[PDB]
Amino acid sequence: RNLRDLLAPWVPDAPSRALREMTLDSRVAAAGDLFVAVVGHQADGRRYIPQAIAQGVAAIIAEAKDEATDGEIREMHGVPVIYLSQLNERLSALAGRFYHEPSDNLRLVGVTGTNGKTTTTQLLAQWSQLLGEISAVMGTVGNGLLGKVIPTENTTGSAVDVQHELAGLVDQGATFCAMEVSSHGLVQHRVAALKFAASVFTNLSRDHLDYHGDMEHYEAAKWLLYSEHHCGQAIINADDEVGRRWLAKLPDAVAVSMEDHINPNCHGRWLKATEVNYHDSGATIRFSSSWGDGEIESHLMGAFNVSNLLLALATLLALGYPLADLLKTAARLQPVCGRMEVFTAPGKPTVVVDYAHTPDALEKALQAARLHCAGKLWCVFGCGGDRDKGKRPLMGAIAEEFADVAVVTDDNPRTEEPRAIINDILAGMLDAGHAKVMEGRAEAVTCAVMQAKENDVVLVAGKGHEDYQIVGNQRLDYSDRVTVARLLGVIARSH
């Protein structure tokens, strides 16, 4: 693409220059690329401009703050350097023009909410594909076409990486993409210029207050998706108190409920479960909606997953997919790795690996785990260091109440003292001494799985799909899934 044409809408005087790729990281800016230098939370990208030029980039767009006037054009070692004010907020738009508005060449669905963004986006991608689409996903478990996902460091990529990845998916033939949109991403303008066909809200509970401060600001951040973005059709979980208040602000939204919260007199379009029967790590779901009624045989475990599937269903119906065809393919939907992944082997306890790392998620995971638990329910978990300390006491209280045996261990300690984190969790229990504490996650999982009996169930929560553990500033190789698989000698049957 050409620098001149790229900036025409803001810097009509920009010099002509062919550009290959656009990047915000100098470490991967190759010869002929466009390096974008912004001020971050830890460093100033502009300080890497010398290196980028030494690497042969074709041009540079840099934040103007404290250095130049908006739209100022300079030259360094023959390389054009254009300064723009409030660059972070114009990144998505800039990347969009650069990659020729990718979100217009596939149906893009964004999903936000405290829990379930991954399962919901994966279900949307799977289902849509079974309905004749070539689908892709972007989220915590990775980005790419279904079956060809590349692991990611973030839930929602940078404003430039997102546009670049959508353009890449479009070139590969993708026609549908379900993307996880984090509250962090919304506040930081990561998806500011994307054109969503639909925007789904799963729920809101305690989490990320180390970033947002309090629940009021956390809610305001997610609300940005509906107030400040081209959100398209709104799909809202009406079982959430927050979702109900939001539905009152969005007349054309679709309300989805599992706990009888649909109000046909106030919700224009809706979908609700009328009957749900749980059995072999799956469930039979009877529902009624503005598009018609029906029965769905799901192979996902727990009530939480019934809600995620219902949200995916309402979205596809709202997007015009025929109910008849959605019902015919529902049975082929598959659960996501690291989420209510069930491991079963003869002579051994059933082990469930789940991502639940918030008070609310843990409660729902333990409640679901006990439905198929004839013996005792064990809960092996921990909390992340350098994060919301307030949720620690709440989770300890949840484990102590909903589980028969609570094994408190480490999660991702990062720079905090392992024990210190553990003490905060125990402080929320009515009786700390009743919990089995044991540092060293690998050891803890092993002890629980080995001690638990065949009719018992062990819930290993907090990590899910993660194949690493952060201790200090190092990323160590570790996976709950591999640990469990090796102990039982089998992969997840449910998956």
Side-chain angles (χ1 to χ4, degrees), residues 174-190:
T175 58
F176 181 101
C177 182
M179 162 191 297
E180 295 183 47
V181 180
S182 67
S183 60
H184 293 70
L186 289 167
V187 165
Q188 287 168 44
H189 317 273
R190 294 181 193 164

mmCIF file with all atom_site columns, all heavy atoms in Angstrom, residues 174-190:
data_model
loop_
_atom_site.group_PDB
_atom_site.id
_atom_site.type_symbol
_atom_site.label_atom_id
_atom_site.label_alt_id
_atom_site.label_comp_id
_atom_site.label_asym_id
_atom_site.label_entity_id
_atom_site.label_seq_id
_atom_site.pdbx_PDB_ins_code
_atom_site.Cartn_x
_atom_site.Cartn_y
_atom_site.Cartn_z
_atom_site.occupancy
_atom_site.B_iso_or_equiv
_atom_site.pdbx_formal_charge
_atom_site.auth_seq_id
_atom_site.auth_comp_id
_atom_site.auth_asym_id
_atom_site.auth_atom_id
_atom_site.pdbx_PDB_model_num
ATOM 1   N N   . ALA A 1 174 ? -11.674 -17.280 4.652  1.00 0.00 ? 174 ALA A N   1
ATOM 2   C CA  . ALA A 1 174 ? -12.623 -17.193 5.763  1.00 0.00 ? 174 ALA A CA  1
ATOM 3   C C   . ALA A 1 174 ? -13.800 -16.277 5.426  1.00 0.00 ? 174 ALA A C   1
ATOM 4   O O   . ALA A 1 174 ? -13.624 -15.216 4.830  1.00 0.00 ? 174 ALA A O   1
ATOM 5   C CB  . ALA A 1 174 ? -11.914 -16.682 7.014  1.00 0.00 ? 174 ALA A CB  1
ATOM 6   N N   . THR A 1 175 ? -15.002 -16.681 5.814  1.00 0.00 ? 175 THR A N   1
ATOM 7   C CA  . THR A 1 175 ? -16.178 -15.862 5.542  1.00 0.00 ? 175 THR A CA  1
ATOM 8   C C   . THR A 1 175 ? -16.915 -15.519 6.831  1.00 0.00 ? 175 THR A C   1
ATOM 9   O O   . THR A 1 175 ? -17.874 -14.745 6.828  1.00 0.00 ? 175 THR A O   1
ATOM 10  C CB  . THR A 1 175 ? -17.144 -16.596 4.601  1.00 0.00 ? 175 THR A CB  1
ATOM 11  O OG1 . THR A 1 175 ? -17.522 -17.843 5.197  1.00 0.00 ? 175 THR A OG1 1
ATOM 12  C CG2 . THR A 1 175 ? -16.469 -16.865 3.250  1.00 0.00 ? 175 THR A CG2 1
ATOM 13  N N   . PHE A 1 176 ? -16.461 -16.111 7.929  1.00 0.00 ? 176 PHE A N   1
ATOM 14  C CA  . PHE A 1 176 ? -17.061 -15.887 9.242  1.00 0.00 ? 176 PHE A CA  1
ATOM 15  C C   . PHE A 1 176 ? -15.958 -15.948 10.300 1.00 0.00 ? 176 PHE A C   1
ATOM 16  O O   . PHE A 1 176 ? -15.051 -16.771 10.215 1.00 0.00 ? 176 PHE A O   1
ATOM 17  C CB  . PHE A 1 176 ? -18.124 -16.963 9.524  1.00 0.00 ? 176 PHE A CB  1
ATOM 18  C CG  . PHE A 1 176 ? -18.833 -16.804 10.854 1.00 0.00 ? 176 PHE A CG  1
ATOM 19  C CD1 . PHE A 1 176 ? -20.108 -16.250 10.913 1.00 0.00 ? 176 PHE A CD1 1
ATOM 20  C CD2 . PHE A 1 176 ? -18.222 -17.207 12.040 1.00 0.00 ? 176 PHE A CD2 1
ATOM 21  C CE1 . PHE A 1 176 ? -20.771 -16.096 12.136 1.00 0.00 ? 176 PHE A CE1 1
ATOM 22  C CE2 . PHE A 1 176 ? -18.872 -17.060 13.267 1.00 0.00 ? 176 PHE A CE2 1
ATOM 23  C CZ  . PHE A 1 176 ? -20.150 -16.502 13.313 1.00 0.00 ? 176 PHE A CZ  1
ATOM 24  N N   . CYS A 1 177 ? -16.031 -15.070 11.292 1.00 0.00 ? 177 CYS A N   1
ATOM 25  C CA  . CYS A 1 177 ? -15.032 -15.059 12.360 1.00 0.00 ? 177 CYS A CA  1
ATOM 26  C C   . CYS A 1 177 ? -15.666 -14.600 13.667 1.00 0.00 ? 177 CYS A C   1
ATOM 27  O O   . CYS A 1 177 ? -16.339 -13.569 13.707 1.00 0.00 ? 177 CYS A O   1
ATOM 28  C CB  . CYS A 1 177 ? -13.862 -14.122 12.012 1.00 0.00 ? 177 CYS A CB  1
ATOM 29  S SG  . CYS A 1 177 ? -12.515 -14.068 13.279 1.00 0.00 ? 177 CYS A SG  1
ATOM 30  N N   . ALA A 1 178 ? -15.459 -15.383 14.718 1.00 0.00 ? 178 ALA A N   1
ATOM 31  C CA  . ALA A 1 178 ? -15.965 -15.057 16.052 1.00 0.00 ? 178 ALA A CA  1
ATOM 32  C C   . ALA A 1 178 ? -14.721 -14.650 16.842 1.00 0.00 ? 178 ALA A C   1
ATOM 33  O O   . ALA A 1 178 ? -13.772 -15.419 16.971 1.00 0.00 ? 178 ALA A O   1
ATOM 34  C CB  . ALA A 1 178 ? -16.623 -16.266 16.676 1.00 0.00 ? 178 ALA A CB  1
ATOM 35  N N   . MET A 1 179 ? -14.740 -13.433 17.367 1.00 0.00 ? 179 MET A N   1
ATOM 36  C CA  . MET A 1 179 ? -13.610 -12.868 18.092 1.00 0.00 ? 179 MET A CA  1
ATOM 37  C C   . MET A 1 179 ? -13.934 -12.512 19.545 1.00 0.00 ? 179 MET A C   1
ATOM 38  O O   . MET A 1 179 ? -15.019 -12.013 19.837 1.00 0.00 ? 179 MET A O   1
ATOM 39  C CB  . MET A 1 179 ? -13.179 -11.621 17.309 1.00 0.00 ? 179 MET A CB  1
ATOM 40  C CG  . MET A 1 179 ? -12.322 -10.595 17.989 1.00 0.00 ? 179 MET A CG  1
ATOM 41  S SD  . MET A 1 179 ? -12.286 -9.029  16.821 1.00 0.00 ? 179 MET A SD  1
ATOM 42  C CE  . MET A 1 179 ? -11.439 -9.808  15.285 1.00 0.00 ? 179 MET A CE  1
ATOM 43  N N   . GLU A 1 180 ? -13.005 -12.792 20.454 1.00 0.00 ? 180 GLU A N   1
ATOM 44  C CA  . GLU A 1 180 ? -13.196 -12.429 21.863 1.00 0.00 ? 180 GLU A CA  1
ATOM 45  C C   . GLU A 1 180 ? -12.793 -10.960 21.994 1.00 0.00 ? 180 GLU A C   1
ATOM 46  O O   . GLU A 1 180 ? -11.716 -10.556 21.539 1.00 0.00 ? 180 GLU A O   1
ATOM 47  C CB  . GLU A 1 180 ? -12.300 -13.262 22.785 1.00 0.00 ? 180 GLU A CB  1
ATOM 48  C CG  . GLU A 1 180 ? -12.614 -14.747 22.819 1.00 0.00 ? 180 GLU A CG  1
ATOM 49  C CD  . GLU A 1 180 ? -11.741 -15.501 23.812 1.00 0.00 ? 180 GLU A CD  1
ATOM 50  O OE1 . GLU A 1 180 ? -11.600 -15.025 24.960 1.00 0.00 ? 180 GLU A OE1 1
ATOM 51  O OE2 . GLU A 1 180 ? -11.202 -16.572 23.454 1.00 0.00 ? 180 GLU A OE2 1
ATOM 52  N N   . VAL A 1 181 ? -13.655 -10.159 22.604 1.00 0.00 ? 181 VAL A N   1
ATOM 53  C CA  . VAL A 1 181 ? -13.364 -8.747  22.790 1.00 0.00 ? 181 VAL A CA  1
ATOM 54  C C   . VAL A 1 181 ? -13.262 -8.500  24.295 1.00 0.00 ? 181 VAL A C   1
ATOM 55  O O   . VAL A 1 181 ? -14.268 -8.525  25.008 1.00 0.00 ? 181 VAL A O   1
ATOM 56  C CB  . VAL A 1 181 ? -14.480 -7.877  22.193 1.00 0.00 ? 181 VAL A CB  1
ATOM 57  C CG1 . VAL A 1 181 ? -14.161 -6.415  22.401 1.00 0.00 ? 181 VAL A CG1 1
ATOM 58  C CG2 . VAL A 1 181 ? -14.641 -8.191  20.701 1.00 0.00 ? 181 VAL A CG2 1
ATOM 59  N N   . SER A 1 182 ? -12.044 -8.281  24.781 1.00 0.00 ? 182 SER A N   1
ATOM 60  C CA  . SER A 1 182 ? -11.842 -8.060  26.213 1.00 0.00 ? 182 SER A CA  1
ATOM 61  C C   . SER A 1 182 ? -12.117 -6.623  26.634 1.00 0.00 ? 182 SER A C   1
ATOM 62  O O   . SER A 1 182 ? -12.048 -5.702  25.813 1.00 0.00 ? 182 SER A O   1
ATOM 63  C CB  . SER A 1 182 ? -10.411 -8.428  26.607 1.00 0.00 ? 182 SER A CB  1
ATOM 64  O OG  . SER A 1 182 ? -9.473  -7.540  26.022 1.00 0.00 ? 182 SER A OG  1
ATOM 65  N N   . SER A 1 183 ? -12.430 -6.437  27.916 1.00 0.00 ? 183 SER A N   1
ATOM 66  C CA  . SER A 1 183 ? -12.689 -5.107  28.454 1.00 0.00 ? 183 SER A CA  1
ATOM 67  C C   . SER A 1 183 ? -11.412 -4.285  28.290 1.00 0.00 ? 183 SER A C   1
ATOM 68  O O   . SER A 1 183 ? -11.471 -3.087  28.029 1.00 0.00 ? 183 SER A O   1
ATOM 69  C CB  . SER A 1 183 ? -13.081 -5.191  29.941 1.00 0.00 ? 183 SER A CB  1
ATOM 70  O OG  . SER A 1 183 ? -12.049 -5.780  30.714 1.00 0.00 ? 183 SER A OG  1
ATOM 71  N N   . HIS A 1 184 ? -10.256 -4.928  28.445 1.00 0.00 ? 184 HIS A N   1
ATOM 72  C CA  . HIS A 1 184 ? -8.985  -4.219  28.266 1.00 0.00 ? 184 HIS A CA  1
ATOM 73  C C   . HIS A 1 184 ? -8.931  -3.719  26.823 1.00 0.00 ? 184 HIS A C   1
ATOM 74  O O   . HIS A 1 184 ? -8.619  -2.561  26.569 1.00 0.00 ? 184 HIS A O   1
ATOM 75  C CB  . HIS A 1 184 ? -7.781  -5.143  28.494 1.00 0.00 ? 184 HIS A CB  1
ATOM 76  C CG  . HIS A 1 184 ? -7.631  -5.619  29.903 1.00 0.00 ? 184 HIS A CG  1
ATOM 77  N ND1 . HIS A 1 184 ? -8.505  -6.514  30.485 1.00 0.00 ? 184 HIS A ND1 1
ATOM 78  C CD2 . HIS A 1 184 ? -6.711  -5.323  30.851 1.00 0.00 ? 184 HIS A CD2 1
ATOM 79  C CE1 . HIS A 1 184 ? -8.130  -6.745  31.730 1.00 0.00 ? 184 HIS A CE1 1
ATOM 80  N NE2 . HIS A 1 184 ? -7.043  -6.035  31.977 1.00 0.00 ? 184 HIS A NE2 1
ATOM 81  N N   . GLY A 1 185 ? -9.230  -4.617  25.886 1.00 0.00 ? 185 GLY A N   1
ATOM 82  C CA  . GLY A 1 185 ? -9.214  -4.269  24.479 1.00 0.00 ? 185 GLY A CA  1
ATOM 83  C C   . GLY A 1 185 ? -10.112 -3.100  24.132 1.00 0.00 ? 185 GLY A C   1
ATOM 84  O O   . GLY A 1 185 ? -9.722  -2.227  23.349 1.00 0.00 ? 185 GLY A O   1
ATOM 85  N N   . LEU A 1 186 ? -11.314 -3.076  24.707 1.00 0.00 ? 186 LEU A N   1
ATOM 86  C CA  . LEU A 1 186 ? -12.254 -1.997  24.441 1.00 0.00 ? 186 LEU A CA  1
ATOM 87  C C   . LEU A 1 186 ? -11.723 -0.649  24.916 1.00 0.00 ? 186 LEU A C   1
ATOM 88  O O   . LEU A 1 186 ? -11.731 0.326   24.174 1.00 0.00 ? 186 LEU A O   1
ATOM 89  C CB  . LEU A 1 186 ? -13.598 -2.299  25.110 1.00 0.00 ? 186 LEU A CB  1
ATOM 90  C CG  . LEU A 1 186 ? -14.344 -3.439  24.411 1.00 0.00 ? 186 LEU A CG  1
ATOM 91  C CD1 . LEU A 1 186 ? -15.494 -3.917  25.273 1.00 0.00 ? 186 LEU A CD1 1
ATOM 92  C CD2 . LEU A 1 186 ? -14.832 -2.950  23.043 1.00 0.00 ? 186 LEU A CD2 1
ATOM 93  N N   . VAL A 1 187 ? -11.258 -0.605  26.156 1.00 0.00 ? 187 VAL A N   1
ATOM 94  C CA  . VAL A 1 187 ? -10.734 0.624   26.719 1.00 0.00 ? 187 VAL A CA  1
ATOM 95  C C   . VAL A 1 187 ? -9.522  1.141   25.946 1.00 0.00 ? 187 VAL A C   1
ATOM 96  O O   . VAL A 1 187 ? -9.375  2.344   25.755 1.00 0.00 ? 187 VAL A O   1
ATOM 97  C CB  . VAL A 1 187 ? -10.358 0.415   28.199 1.00 0.00 ? 187 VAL A CB  1
ATOM 98  C CG1 . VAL A 1 187 ? -9.478  1.560   28.699 1.00 0.00 ? 187 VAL A CG1 1
ATOM 99  C CG2 . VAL A 1 187 ? -11.631 0.343   29.027 1.00 0.00 ? 187 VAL A CG2 1
ATOM 100 N N   . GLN A 1 188 ? -8.682  0.223   25.479 1.00 0.00 ? 188 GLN A N   1
ATOM 101 C CA  . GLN A 1 188 ? -7.469  0.580   24.745 1.00 0.00 ? 188 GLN A CA  1
ATOM 102 C C   . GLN A 1 188 ? -7.650  0.762   23.233 1.00 0.00 ? 188 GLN A C   1
ATOM 103 O O   . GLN A 1 188 ? -6.666  0.844   22.501 1.00 0.00 ? 188 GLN A O   1
ATOM 104 C CB  . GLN A 1 188 ? -6.383  -0.470  25.022 1.00 0.00 ? 188 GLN A CB  1
ATOM 105 C CG  . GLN A 1 188 ? -5.788  -0.379  26.428 1.00 0.00 ? 188 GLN A CG  1
ATOM 106 C CD  . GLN A 1 188 ? -4.928  -1.578  26.795 1.00 0.00 ? 188 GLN A CD  1
ATOM 107 O OE1 . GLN A 1 188 ? -4.108  -2.042  26.001 1.00 0.00 ? 188 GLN A OE1 1
ATOM 108 N NE2 . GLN A 1 188 ? -5.107  -2.080  28.015 1.00 0.00 ? 188 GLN A NE2 1
ATOM 109 N N   . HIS A 1 189 ? -8.900  0.817   22.776 1.00 0.00 ? 189 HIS A N   1
ATOM 110 C CA  . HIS A 1 189 ? -9.231  1.023   21.350 1.00 0.00 ? 189 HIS A CA  1
ATOM 111 C C   . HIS A 1 189 ? -8.727  -0.057  20.380 1.00 0.00 ? 189 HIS A C   1
ATOM 112 O O   . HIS A 1 189 ? -8.540  0.211   19.186 1.00 0.00 ? 189 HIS A O   1
ATOM 113 C CB  . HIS A 1 189 ? -8.697  2.388   20.880 1.00 0.00 ? 189 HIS A CB  1
ATOM 114 C CG  . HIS A 1 189 ? -8.931  3.502   21.854 1.00 0.00 ? 189 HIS A CG  1
ATOM 115 N ND1 . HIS A 1 189 ? -10.089 4.248   21.870 1.00 0.00 ? 189 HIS A ND1 1
ATOM 116 C CD2 . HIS A 1 189 ? -8.129  4.030   22.810 1.00 0.00 ? 189 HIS A CD2 1
ATOM 117 C CE1 . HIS A 1 189 ? -9.987  5.197   22.785 1.00 0.00 ? 189 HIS A CE1 1
ATOM 118 N NE2 . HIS A 1 189 ? -8.807  5.086   23.370 1.00 0.00 ? 189 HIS A NE2 1
ATOM 119 N N   . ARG A 1 190 ? -8.528  -1.274  20.874 1.00 0.00 ? 190 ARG A N   1
ATOM 120 C CA  . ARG A 1 190 ? -8.023  -2.362  20.030 1.00 0.00 ? 190 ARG A CA  1
ATOM 121 C C   . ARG A 1 190 ? -8.932  -2.796  18.868 1.00 0.00 ? 190 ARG A C   1
ATOM 122 O O   . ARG A 1 190 ? -8.438  -3.294  17.849 1.00 0.00 ? 190 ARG A O   1
ATOM 123 C CB  . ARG A 1 190 ? -7.676  -3.579  20.894 1.00 0.00 ? 190 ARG A CB  1
ATOM 124 C CG  . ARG A 1 190 ? -6.507  -3.354  21.856 1.00 0.00 ? 190 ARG A CG  1
ATOM 125 C CD  . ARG A 1 190 ? -6.199  -4.622  22.667 1.00 0.00 ? 190 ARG A CD  1
ATOM 126 N NE  . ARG A 1 190 ? -5.300  -4.356  23.792 1.00 0.00 ? 190 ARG A NE  1
ATOM 127 C CZ  . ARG A 1 190 ? -5.115  -5.184  24.817 1.00 0.00 ? 190 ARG A CZ  1
ATOM 128 N NH1 . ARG A 1 190 ? -5.764  -6.340  24.870 1.00 0.00 ? 190 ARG A NH1 1
ATOM 129 N NH2 . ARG A 1 190 ? -4.292  -4.848  25.804 1.00 0.00 ? 190 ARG A NH2 1
#
